[PDB]
Each structure stands twice: as structure tokens, then as C-alpha cells.
Design a binder for these strands. Sequence first.
RNA 1: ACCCACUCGGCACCUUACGAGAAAUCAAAGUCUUUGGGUUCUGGGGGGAGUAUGGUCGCAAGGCUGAAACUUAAAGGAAUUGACGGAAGGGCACCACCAGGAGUGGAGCCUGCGGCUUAAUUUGACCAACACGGGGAAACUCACCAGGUCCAGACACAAUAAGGAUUGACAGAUUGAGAGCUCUUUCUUGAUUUUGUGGGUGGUGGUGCAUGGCCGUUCUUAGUUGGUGGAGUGAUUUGUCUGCUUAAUUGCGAUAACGAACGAGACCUUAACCUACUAAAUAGUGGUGCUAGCAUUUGCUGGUUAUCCACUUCUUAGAGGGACUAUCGGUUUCAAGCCGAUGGAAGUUUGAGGCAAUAACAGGUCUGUGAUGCCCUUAGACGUUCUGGGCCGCACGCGCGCUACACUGACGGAGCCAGCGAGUCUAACCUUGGCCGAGAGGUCUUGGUAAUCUUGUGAAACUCCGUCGUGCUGGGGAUAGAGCAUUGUAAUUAUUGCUCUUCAACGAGGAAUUCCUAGUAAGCGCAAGUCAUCAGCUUGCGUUGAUUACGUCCCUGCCCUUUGUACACAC
Lengths: 75, 65
Amino acid sequence: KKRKKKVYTTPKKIKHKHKKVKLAVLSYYKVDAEGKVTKLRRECSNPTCGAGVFLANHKDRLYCGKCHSVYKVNA
Amino acid sequence: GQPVNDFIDTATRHVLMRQGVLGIKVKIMRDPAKSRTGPKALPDAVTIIEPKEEEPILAPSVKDY
RNA sequence: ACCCACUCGGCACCUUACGAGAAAUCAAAGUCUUUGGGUUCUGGGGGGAGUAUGGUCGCAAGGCUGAAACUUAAAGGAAUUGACGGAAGGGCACCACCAGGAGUGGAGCCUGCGGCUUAAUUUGACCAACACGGGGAAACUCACCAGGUCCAGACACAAUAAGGAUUGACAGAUUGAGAGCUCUUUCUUGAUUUUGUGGGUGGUGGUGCAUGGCCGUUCUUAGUUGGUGGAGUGAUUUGUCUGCUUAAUUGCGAUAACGAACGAGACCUUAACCUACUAAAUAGUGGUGCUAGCAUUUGCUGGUUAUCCACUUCUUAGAGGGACUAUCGGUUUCAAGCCGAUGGAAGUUUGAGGCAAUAACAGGUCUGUGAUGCCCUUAGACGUUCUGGGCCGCACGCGCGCUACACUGACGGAGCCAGCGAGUCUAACCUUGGCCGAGAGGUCUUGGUAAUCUUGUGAAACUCCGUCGUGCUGGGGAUAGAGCAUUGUAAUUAUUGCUCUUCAACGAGGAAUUCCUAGUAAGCGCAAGUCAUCAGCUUGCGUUGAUUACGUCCCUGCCCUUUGUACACAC
Ligand SMILES: [Mg+2]
Ligand SMILES: [Mg+2]
Ligand SMILES: [Mg+2]
Ligand SMILES: [Mg+2]
Ligand SMILES: [Mg+2]
Ligand SMILES: [Mg+2]
Ligand SMILES: [Mg+2]
Ligand SMILES: [Mg+2]
Ligand SMILES: [Mg+2]
Ligand SMILES: [Mg+2]
Ligand SMILES: [Mg+2]
Ligand SMILES: [Mg+2]
Ligand SMILES: [Mg+2]
């Protein structure tokens, strides 16, 4: 059985890669002059989300990160 | 025949060699006279018992204990 | 003229070679590496070629004498084994024929194959391919086509690597898609990986002409082999055979063979016989003993071992018996056997199978296999999944089949009989019964893991009584339209079932060709396999049940012997 060379009608697509950013401490916590700190991110209502659930942010919604829930910053 | 099932035992093996597979077939006919189960001899292997030949007497010779 | 005994010369024969020969064979072809009686002629691998030329003879035809160039690895002799023969002899087969039966080939449809078409219409196979791959494909199967993911890239090494090496992601573009596949801003996890280098693993990728295993075929036949001995320089041969006989290399026998082996037979399974044994609410019968239901000076039935006693004829299955061609009559190298009749359940090896030798085929299968060598491929994959499509595509040709062409029938009513099976609790299998529905089916329950229930599978052909009335007709039901259900996520290219409507060829089929000898052909249905659904297929089962023949070698072939061969890739 002879087989031909597959010829593609579409360009090759690349596999996505994790974004390289050196921001792991910059936008997570802030330190006051005396030393008092309060976490500025929100808390998932579902208890199986973690104390450090660290709800992310978008332009019009807030992303959970682990439980994949959606909230609003303007609540 | 049936004595193939009764007395013939066969095995088949494949042998992986650098040039291919080599088939081995082993066939063994065990002596029927051995073992205690099933037929102990081949069919039509008829054996005859020796007559235990005895001479004939002439006189009646009544015998009493 | 005959007979007998001789003898010389001659044409020759028979046996065997002591001898010779490569052998066939030879009384010379002996007296030859132990080579010498005398003498003439001829040959030196096969062709070119008895040709060319010269000479010579001939009236001519031609004869006699007679090269070379060049070409070529064999040509040739005798014998062996096989194969083949429009060779002979002897046997045999319904995958041969005769006498026939049923047909197929003609029609419509189903299915497989080729060809065309197509993105693909995956593919193997050409007596011994073509309802075969258990190949009845909606998804899967799948191997093909258009696309989308994923790594299920083990291990070793090196590099990146404190937020990194890495993943995963709601929504919005996007994609057939609620695949974060790719992205749009940015969160989760954390030395599990990424990248590269070796390497590895998969592959229904190729190679069945590299292989194993299995299967088919040669070949349904009777055939095959060594030990010792005999023959031959040897390959080989005899054993393993003239005749008779057998289904049989089965035997009687003959015999430079003897004694053995495999195959055949024997054996095993199944089918028939057993009023013999052992017994059985998972099989039955009787007593109706028990109540009893219906008709009546006794029949048919109901519930019948937790209502009850018996008892195995029928049913079941264990141990057994039974047939060994028994007896008889004939015939025979009167032996192996064969033909009739009588008994017997059974007398073609009683029927049918299972198993089944040596040697082989470039027979089929790499698409059954985590059987497999080699080659190719391996991250945009020939790996694996997911969506959709194809495998089914139709100017056509062919092979298995199904349904028919009608009155030995169709239709309607009624009668009303098998055997082989299978069946769920790791989940929905076989389904009784009641109810609903024209139907197909739906619903509520029951029993059955089964000699217990489905199931007495109350199958069909068939039978009886009626409608039809020789009109392609009320035969035929292809094609097509409408609706109702079931299986399935999914039914369109209509899965299948049901109802109404449409109602085509087909009036018995050219050449040609298949199968079969008794419970067989043929008709008829049923169960199982494949199966969620789907039989017009297969494997088995039973019901009804012929005609013809107990033969031959004419055709097609098979076996043995002899014979010829310039065949061995074997006519
Ligand atoms: Mg046998
Ligand atoms: Mg003479
Ligand atoms: Mg010469
Ligand atoms: Mg016909
Ligand atoms: Mg498909
Ligand atoms: Mg082959
Ligand atoms: Mg010898
Ligand atoms: Mg698919
Ligand atoms: Mg097909
Ligand atoms: Mg029955
Ligand atoms: Mg189907
Ligand atoms: Mg079926
Ligand atoms: Mg089939």
C-alpha cells in the first residue's frame, strides 16, 4: 500500500506557553509604613477555595483562580 | 484415533530469534503399559493367556479324602 | 526316407557370464594399466558444414575430394526416479457420466465481486476468490476521507529552572462544538515537567516471496518408511508382488526376502434395540385412594408426594447386554471372499461423523494475537481519541440466493402436530398472566441462574369446510406516497415492525451449468451464531416425504501395473 505525503491547507499552530512575568510579590501584598497588612483580594464563598484563594481581576469581572468563579469588583 | 487423546501429548512453542520466529512442536507417546488411569494398552493389542497345558490321565481313579 | 552316435563346414538360437563394458548388453563388444598375433580405413567438444573454393567425374540431377573466418558451454551416450501420453491392462468416483429428480442460467429483489464514479467509496482473496474474512459497517467496529485535540514521547544525559521547569482555567473572540485547542487582560499548581540529544514505545503501516501458528488444497484416495539381507559402479531397487478378493498396501496367498512401523482398520462421539438391572414432584402412568366439575348402570376431565399410595411401558442417564455378516442354500486357485433366503431392533464398514500418514504448494492469513524478523513512521504522527462523511455511491458484466410465474393454487374460517436450543442480580436476559391498542406495540405483575418457567416454544408445510374461476386474474408484490410505533445519544442516504394506498417485470426461462441414491432429493418451518436494532446468510434441528439406478468408463477426473519420452519451471 503506497501512501502520499500529507499536504496541509492551514498554517501550523503553536502550542501555548505559560506567560513569563517577574511579578510574584509585586501585586500580591502591600506593606504599610508601620507594618500593618491586609489582603486586598477577595474571598471565595465556597469553603473549598482556600484562605489564599486570591481572586483575580479582569476589566468587568473578578476571576477566582481555583474554583473558577466569577464576581464583580463593583459589588 | 482416540489413543491420540489417550497417549499422545503435544506442546507447541515459539522461539524468538534474531532472524525470525522458530516454531517448536514436541510430540510424546508415553508407554500405555504404565500409569493406572484410563486404558492401559492400545486398542487391538490383544494378548493371549498361556493354556497351562496339562496331560490327560487314563484311569478314572476315584479319589476320596 | 526316418532313428541313434559321431564328425567337418554354415545360418542361427538358449543359459550364464568366470571375462569385458559407462551401461544397454556382448561367446565376442572376452584373452586390455598383468596394456604388443598381422594389417587397412576412420575420429579428436558442439555449430558454421559436407558449406565455400580449386580439382575431377556426370547430359543433367549430382557424386568424389574438401576448408576457413566466425560463433558457442555444452552438445551427446546409457541408465534412475518422477511427471506426462489423442499409449495399453486392471480398478474407482453423483465435487464423473448413465436413468432421473430438484433446479441455476431468463424476471423483480437481497447479497458478494469486478468496472465506473468519488474527498473517500479502506482492504485481503481470482476447482482450491466472489451470503468468504464467522465481513448482516448509522456511532463504535475502521483499516478510508475532511478537520479538531492528546501523548498514553519509559529511561539516561545536558540545558532552563525561586516563581521557574511546568501545567489547569470562567467569560469574549474563535470552533461543528460548553476542545483555554489558539488567543483577549491575569489567576491557580509547584523539581510531578519543558527543550534538546541518544533511546524507547505504539502502528488494521509494507513485506504471507523473510517467518511461526492455524487452515485449505494436492487427496477421499490408499498410500508411505527405515533395520538386516539380496541386486546394481551408481542414482536407485527388492521388501512394498502375477492372480483372486476388499471400501482399503483389506486379506488369501506367491515369494530374495525376513521381520517391523505409520496410515487403513481397530478406536471415540452420536443415532437406532432392550418390557433385563438401578431409580426418579426438576419425567411420567395407574389407583380417581382424596375431595371433585360435566353428561349417564362409566365416560371425559380438575386440583393429584407436605392431600396420598404405588410403579418405571413411555422420558431421563449410569452400569451392562446385543451383531460376529449368525444360520441355511449356492459359487470361488473352493482360501480370502461374494450372492440370495430365514431369523433379528439393526446384515453398504448397520447409518452419520470425530480423529487421520509421508512429501509438498513461494496456496491464504503480518487486518486474531502483548506470535514475529527486516524496512518505514513516530509529535502538524502511518500512534490514540472526537465530530462528520464513506464502506450502501450506479450507463454495465458476473457468482451465491430469496420470492414467483398460479386452481397439485391464492384468500377466509376452523382443525391442529415437532426436534435441536437459549435465557438476568458484577443488571435488565427468556418472559407467562391481566389490562389497553386494528396493528406494530404499551403498561401492571409473575415465574425462571432453568428436565422446574418462558414452553406441550399449540412452527410451517399440511388437513377439512367455504370465497375465487383460467382473466397478468382475487397469481406476483417490485417501485412509490401518507401515517403509527419500537432499538438506539443519533434512523436523513429511508434500522426494523405495522396500517392504507400504487400494483412493474414475471405465463416456466438460449447456449450453458450445479447438487444428489432412502428417511436421501425436494418442500416446510424452528432454534442457535453474528445481535441495542437488523436475515433473503450460515450452523444445526425436526415435519411431509418421491422418481430413478444398484451400472459404466463415453465425458470429467482418481489409484495401481506396463510402456514411450528430446519433459524435471515436469504438457
Ligand atoms: Mg480411524
Ligand atoms: Mg547357412
Ligand atoms: Mg570437431
Ligand atoms: Mg431457472
Ligand atoms: Mg466510521
Ligand atoms: Mg504462503
Ligand atoms: Mg541394503
Ligand atoms: Mg470516527
Ligand atoms: Mg460490503
Ligand atoms: Mg419436547
Ligand atoms: Mg445494520
Ligand atoms: Mg437470528
Ligand atoms: Mg455472513
